[PDB]
Scaffold this active site. Structure first.
Site, short mmCIF file in Angstrom:
data_model
loop_
_atom_site.label_atom_id
_atom_site.label_comp_id
_atom_site.label_asym_id
_atom_site.label_seq_id
_atom_site.Cartn_x
_atom_site.Cartn_y
_atom_site.Cartn_z
N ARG C 61 57.31 12.21 3.31
CA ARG C 61 57.57 12.05 1.83
C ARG C 61 58.48 11.25 1.19
O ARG C 61 58.40 11.02 -0.02
CB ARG C 61 58.04 13.58 1.42
CG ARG C 61 57.23 14.07 0.19
CD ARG C 61 57.84 15.31 -0.69
NE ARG C 61 58.46 16.25 0.21
CZ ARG C 61 59.70 16.71 0.61
NH1 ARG C 61 60.78 15.79 0.39
NH2 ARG C 61 59.55 17.66 1.38
N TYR C 114 44.85 8.67 -23.04
CA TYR C 114 43.83 9.12 -22.10
C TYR C 114 43.87 10.50 -22.25
O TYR C 114 45.11 11.15 -21.86
CB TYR C 114 44.00 8.45 -20.68
CG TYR C 114 43.40 9.44 -19.68
CD1 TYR C 114 41.78 9.78 -19.51
CD2 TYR C 114 44.29 9.89 -18.75
CE1 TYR C 114 41.49 10.76 -18.57
CE2 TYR C 114 43.85 10.89 -17.88
CZ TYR C 114 42.38 11.05 -17.74
OH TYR C 114 41.99 12.16 -16.88
N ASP C 187 50.16 0.81 -19.43
CA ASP C 187 49.21 1.16 -18.27
C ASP C 187 48.10 0.01 -18.58
O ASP C 187 47.38 0.14 -19.12
CB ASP C 187 48.67 2.50 -18.67
CG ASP C 187 47.84 3.06 -17.98
OD1 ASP C 187 47.58 2.33 -16.86
OD2 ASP C 187 47.38 4.37 -18.11
N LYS C 212 40.76 3.27 -9.68
CA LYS C 212 39.81 2.39 -10.38
C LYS C 212 39.42 1.04 -9.77
O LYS C 212 38.82 0.91 -8.77
CB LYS C 212 39.93 2.03 -11.80
CG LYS C 212 40.43 3.44 -12.54
CD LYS C 212 39.40 4.45 -12.40
CE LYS C 212 39.97 5.83 -12.66
NZ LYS C 212 38.70 6.93 -13.35
C1 HEN Z 1 44.01 4.20 -18.28
C2 HEN Z 1 44.08 5.39 -17.27
N1 HEN Z 1 45.25 5.70 -16.74
C3 HEN Z 1 45.57 6.57 -15.93
C4 HEN Z 1 44.66 7.43 -15.63
C5 HEN Z 1 44.78 8.78 -14.91
O1 HEN Z 1 45.06 8.46 -13.36
P1 HEN Z 1 44.20 8.80 -12.08
O2 HEN Z 1 42.86 9.17 -12.58
O3 HEN Z 1 44.25 7.72 -10.86
O4 HEN Z 1 44.67 9.97 -11.74
C6 HEN Z 1 43.19 6.97 -16.31
C7 HEN Z 1 42.15 8.15 -15.82
N2 HEN Z 1 40.76 7.99 -16.19
C8 HEN Z 1 39.62 8.58 -16.27
C9 HEN Z 1 39.48 9.68 -15.33
C10 HEN Z 1 39.07 10.67 -15.90
C11 HEN Z 1 39.08 12.07 -15.28
P2 HEN Z 1 38.01 13.23 -16.52
O5 HEN Z 1 37.01 12.24 -16.95
O6 HEN Z 1 39.09 13.65 -17.85
O7 HEN Z 1 37.36 14.73 -15.70
C12 HEN Z 1 38.28 7.73 -16.90
O8 HEN Z 1 38.57 7.22 -17.94
O9 HEN Z 1 37.19 7.72 -16.53
C13 HEN Z 1 42.91 6.12 -17.16
O10 HEN Z 1 41.97 5.75 -17.42
C1 HEN Z 2 60.40 26.69 3.94
C2 HEN Z 2 60.25 25.08 3.28
N1 HEN Z 2 59.48 25.07 2.38
C3 HEN Z 2 59.08 23.91 1.75
C4 HEN Z 2 59.39 22.77 2.32
C5 HEN Z 2 58.96 21.40 1.73
O1 HEN Z 2 57.51 21.03 1.82
P1 HEN Z 2 57.09 19.58 2.23
O2 HEN Z 2 58.17 18.97 3.33
O3 HEN Z 2 55.72 19.67 3.07
O4 HEN Z 2 57.33 18.88 1.11
C6 HEN Z 2 60.12 22.73 3.64
C7 HEN Z 2 60.66 21.45 4.31
N2 HEN Z 2 61.39 21.21 5.33
C8 HEN Z 2 61.89 20.45 5.96
C9 HEN Z 2 61.72 19.12 5.24
C10 HEN Z 2 62.97 18.31 5.16
C11 HEN Z 2 63.03 16.89 4.56
P2 HEN Z 2 64.71 16.33 4.95
O5 HEN Z 2 64.59 15.30 6.19
O6 HEN Z 2 65.67 17.35 5.14
O7 HEN Z 2 65.21 15.42 3.51
C12 HEN Z 2 62.60 20.62 7.22
O8 HEN Z 2 62.87 22.03 7.61
O9 HEN Z 2 63.03 19.63 7.94
C13 HEN Z 2 60.66 24.10 3.96
O10 HEN Z 2 61.31 23.99 5.32
#
Ligand code: HEN
Ligand code: HEN
Ligand code: HEN
Ligand code: HEN
Lengths: 396, 396, 396, 396
Positions: C61, C114, C187, C212
């Site tokens: 992550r 948007y 953007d 896109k």
């Molecule tokens: C300039 C611009 N920036 C950021 C985003 C959102 O980022 P993401 O889509 O990667 O999560 C969009 C989405 N644009 C569209 C997507 C829309 C989804 P909807 O049409 O509302 O269901 C579009 O214009 O076709 C965009 O047009």
């Molecule tokens: C109960 C519990 N819930 C939610 C999360 C977060 O979910 P995600 O990791 O999929 O985002 C974690 C992460 N657990 C750990 C992750 C830690 C990250 P670190 O390396 O300590 O900064 C761990 O037990 O080692 C967890 O132990």
């Protein structure tokens, strides 16, 4: 591999990984390398490699970092010197034969071969003037005889067999053949490197169709051959030309699937056996084929060279084509389809599934009956399965 | 494919997709199906299928929904009846030969064959008593002669050729061979279905190594053969046994690559040509091979059957082994490795790259000079490349 | 990056790869690392890392070898200090805002936002007491005013805009805002790092929706923000909690997509423009929106800060809801759907596509007309596209 | 789900697959759909969809055919109404809080929260005026009090806890909270839908970090929340904006991993326990934390609401920082890294691994000791592991 990892399961997991990969990363898993070729920093180096002073796959068709892992992994499991990986089971056998058996040479196989594997040997190989002798798995006499009659280049067979899971006393055969210079290749697909070690029993080469158990998830095809270097290499060479290379993505999927190899086998090994016995006792079940049962022809051999008996169980039903059909049709859990070895349970009527292209007579020509049913127990809970199977035999 | 789609590029994109897929989805792209087998709802249906009343791949080695797309796509491009997809180019050629050429039959190929392709024909095929006649690409006489001397089963060659990009008057050859019942198979790998239509020129079968231009990203291997059904099918049958199945994931990757096939070819076609001339004029450049140039032996043919001339350019440098090497070592953009046709630019010294296993004398036996350099122009900006190449020769 | 590469296209290709990857390999392409965490060889080292003496992503992550590449690549293109990669465009803007705008702070955006990006700012941010001022893209007075009225934390807008592709005189705005300590975020999704360099024009941060153009294959979603370290880092931190990490596989697909960024844009930049003019001239075409045209409100600005005008073209048809619909329904090549920037062509009626939840009146509240059509030209052949469009522009 | 599926394992395998997928295929596995958007055949239909008369994900950020499968799958397992899937656990909790807790609202959590999860609640939430109360897992009194003191919007905690695996009497707590209108959310990550059903015990929402057990292969991150529709949906909406979409490929890997969920858990559940006991009896082991042990504070609760006790085992060593480190350094099988639950065994010293940024005093502020070691037993063979751990302990 390691002095600390003594259980197969442990190996299967960290085999060819925990200690090093050759592709340095502080990552836990193996990185999937999607490349068609490998470069060099300067002509000087390239020469080095070409002069056997450096290491490189050069071209993808010759190797891949993400693949070698699985290669060594399986090697460790089967405790082999080296392992090769094709694009599919069939590929492996195919290549293997074309590579080891000279022209005009002779070969010896069993009668319970797998459909296609048969055709190849009976239609292609002869083009190379390669003649073959087909003996029954058990009939050791025929083998010993053929061994003396003609000049066998290599004995090849699968143990367990398909679909009657017949077994070959590997150690014995191995001995006989090696006395006459013959080579022994066992297709331990059904067995799995966990339920037996063909190589250990003396076999020269052991190959598997990772498409089944090894990948055990019904989502990838792959061949695999393991054995002594001086041998496996000779094949790899030919492989480098026939170009049946395995894609990295596939390779990885197998590695991942093998992460829980033991776990999966263990469970299947049980379910099967238990379900086997249950079936034999069933009235509507005419006959049951399984190395685990005492009723099995080579059960004494299975008991001597195996530690498990696979997850595949074959059994004839007390009825006919349409009747047997009615049965499988009633099942609710398993999928009606070819293949086997995955978490998902599968069933099929060999007679129809892979022999419908023949006549009722020509079919029986090889034990294939219209009753014969092949059950590849998945990993689903036993009770769930049993209940289904039972609820089925009832509908008949 | 469609009436409203006439330009190659437009096809490559929507070919075998825009109108339907066989795997219904309201998704734009083709879905990657990772299955090792296909199921049936009831024995009844399975029978239907087996009896040719229903459609199903049955097993993964026989087909895949995510692959057929790519199949039809390429079919559309080459304007073929049906196409097949192997795990690698070599796989294709291999199978195709083993599939079409009968035992003891005769075949005719050119001298400028690709290394490995050669070996197979010279070492494996003979095992089946299949003899071959090697003539020069241009030498139409030799062909016409051989056509009458022996009984040719199939004429096979690549056009352009490797690495001297020699070209064969497909239309002519096709005519001659067809007069004697021989078959013609053209390896238009270098050409690309966009720069030429061997099938349209009369060829019986055209095959490509998707590894190069089709995928054009240097991250996947793939064989591909297109042509008439009655023919390709005969291969598909043997393919179903040698098991050189292509993985769904790879398939998709190609489908994705071809999404910008034209765009990629277009640019490469230019850079190559332009760079070529600049090279021919250069003092340190002893010779330059490229169908686009007027200096090329079959330029009149190239100009007649092609629309572009690939992005691969070979040329001998005014120096020796170590000198030529010094050149390539200087380059900063291209990678030193095999393969070609990808966005990334690649260079190599065939002599070393794929012939270092031979003696200086045995090398020259086939034009392979220590000077000879093969440049696979990528897609990087022209000026950037030119400046590179030039600045490179600058030090020799 | 390097000295030998001067054209963006060349960069987009070898950016953060040709010279080194940090994950040593002799492979051409970048290896997809599928790991959820990273290990250490001993406590000692782990400490080092924890004490900023060693480098490691520790947890997935927080980073990934296969991702950073794409990170440095985009960085180079936009000529930024560092770039971040979320799971989706929206994520980016979202995180970015929550990260930089303090509680109770003020922000300034344009009217042509948007849809969703709007809602977030209008429904979520207010929860943190963050107020906003919505000014017209062109209305620089309003901006200068607000700049003095309230205490603006950051000015945020997209240029070109959606769907009327309006444009903001980045350089100018940047100057004004910075005079009052406000931050600027552009953007440039529609623009693409190739058609303009917002960062170079003075902008503080530039974000794109790799979903896109960058990916340009309609098969992956991804957020992306590039800018100065001291800034972007502040966001990456928050990102390390909201957990909107991007999957490796996704990352790679983008890197692969960007291997042909220039090529795709170039073509689209043309088709669009050309098609635009053609459309403006058409009798049935009431109005056309495109920075490239002289009719566009900020054409003089577009002409001053861009080098291309995207591939998206909006235009109102001389009819009504049902009529405009009839038009799009007649088209044969584009797919009726949201998104844009992929090789495949796409069309949609914003009025319905992303505003049908509102009343005819509330709709017009923001220029959204029932005639308004948004054509995202793919990469298919021009003629092929034109013929299609016209063939429909006549069935009305 | 179905009738023929009574055991959890059987469900985990065929849950949301065996009966139907919504994306018709005669394939066994679920097909990975790599699309960024979904199309329509005509405006008419689109309207239908927009008017809730048809079904479609429209945009990838809103859904994916390859994802929904895993969604329903988990749903079935936890026996929930619906499930949501984020890009990472953190994302889930994050979104969940931001989505349910109103502005200025209050929340109640335990003291043994996971590091990051804590911070968010302690630094971000307060920006929205959301105050919280931190009580001890066992201290029900505090909970009952807070319930009456302030107006709790939702009670949130993990059970087991991290890293002391403390447990919360779900049923009880649920009862109390529901009496005051509060919502209950349990982070059963450590538990797994197999070792406990929080939802059944009364919990309102149960979330997991599929990054751990669900995927169980240490090669993918993924958040997941299951619960009643009326609830989860409210989150899916905000999720459709924060855009923390999970990639299809990742989704598949989890689906594939869960294919052997039970098998994996089962083994780990044992190894842990058995190993736990062995450790507690060890002289060099000062203390051991595990719900399975009788020594554990809430063992009677674990015993009443669980069927297993995970594979995670925490224990303090009889030494100091440098001494404890010496221990883990001695281990040969587990990897020293964060995360847990995959086939590969992992170990870490929470003190350093995730608290080194604090002072020795501030560290102890939360039970984190320099001796504390968290062992996440893999799937390797028990004896193999034991031997290792043992041989390890000796070094001291
Ligand atoms: C300039 C611009 N920036 C950021 C985003 C959102 O980022 P993401 O889509 O990667 O999560 C969009 C989405 N644009 C569209 C997507 C829309 C989804 P909807 O049409 O509302 O269901 C579009 O214009 O076709 C965009 O047009
Ligand atoms: C109960 C519990 N819930 C939610 C999360 C977060 O979910 P995600 O990791 O999929 O985002 C974690 C992460 N657990 C750990 C992750 C830690 C990250 P670190 O390396 O300590 O900064 C761990 O037990 O080692 C967890 O132990
Ligand atoms: C023992 C054995 N060996 C080698 C192979 C071939 O491996 P490959 O599939 O990975 O290439 C098979 C295939 N087994 C089956 C596949 C059969 C295909 P058919 O059912 O004849 O169309 C089966 O159903 O058990 C096999 O059972
Ligand atoms: C025209 C042509 N056709 C078919 C193939 C083989 O396809 P496959 O690789 O996908 O199986 C090749 C290979 N060409 C080369 C590959 C060679 C492998 P090497 O670099 O000699 O080890 C090359 O000259 O770069 C080729 O040049």
């Amino acid at each position: 591999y390691a002095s600390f990892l003594n259980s197969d399961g442990s190996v299967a997991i960290h085999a060819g990984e925990r200690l090093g990969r050759g592709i340095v990363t502080d990552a836990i898993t193996t990185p999937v390398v999607n490349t068609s070729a490998y470069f060099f920093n300067k002509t000087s180096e390239l020469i080095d490699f070409k002069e056997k002073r450096r290491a490189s796959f050069e071209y993808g068709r010759y190797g891949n970092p993400t693949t070698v892992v699985l290669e060594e992994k399986i090697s460790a499991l089967e405790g082999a010197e080296s392992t090769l990986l094709m694009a599919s089971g069939m590929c492996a056998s195919t290549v293997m034969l074309l590579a080891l058996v000279p022209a005009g040479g002779h070969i010896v196989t069993t009668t319970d071969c797998y459909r296609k594997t048969r055709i190849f040997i009976e239609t292609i190989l002869p083009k190379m003037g390669i003649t073959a002798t087909v003996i029954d798995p058990a009939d050791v006499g025929a083998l010993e005889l053929a061994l003396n009659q003609k000049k066998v280049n290599l004995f090849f067979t699968e143990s367990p067999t398909n679909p009657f899971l017949r077994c070959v006393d590997i150690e014995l055969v191995s001995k006989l053949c090696h006395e006459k210079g013959a080579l022994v290749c066992i297709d331990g697909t059904f067995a799995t490197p966990l339920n037996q070690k063909a190589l250990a029993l003396g076999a020269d080469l052991v190959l598997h169709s990772a498409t089944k158990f090894l990948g055990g998830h019904n989502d990838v095809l792959a061949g695999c051959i393991s054995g002594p270097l001086k041998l496996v290499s000779e094949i790899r060479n030919l492989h480098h030309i026939l170009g049946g290379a395995l894609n990295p993505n596939a390779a990885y999927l197998i590695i991942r699937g093998m992460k829980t190899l033991h776990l999966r086998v263990q469970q299947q090994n049980s379910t099967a056996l238990r379900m086997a016995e249950i079936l034999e006792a069933h009235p509507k079940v005419r006959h049951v084929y399984y190395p685990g049962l005492q009723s099995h022809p080579e059960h004494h051999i299975a008991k001597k060279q195996m530690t498990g008996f696979g997850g595949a169980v074959s059994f004839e039903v007390d009825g006919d084509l349409l009747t047997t059909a009615k049965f499988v049709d009633a099942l609710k859990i398993p999928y009606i389809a070819p293949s086997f070895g995955g978490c998902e349970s599968i069933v099929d009527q060999p007679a129809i599934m892979s022999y419908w292209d023949l006549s009722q007579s020509d079919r029986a020509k090889y034990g294939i009956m219209d009753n014969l049913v092949r059950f590849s127990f998945g990993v689903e809970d036993f009770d769930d399965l049993k209940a289904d199977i039972l609820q089925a035999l009832d509908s008949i």
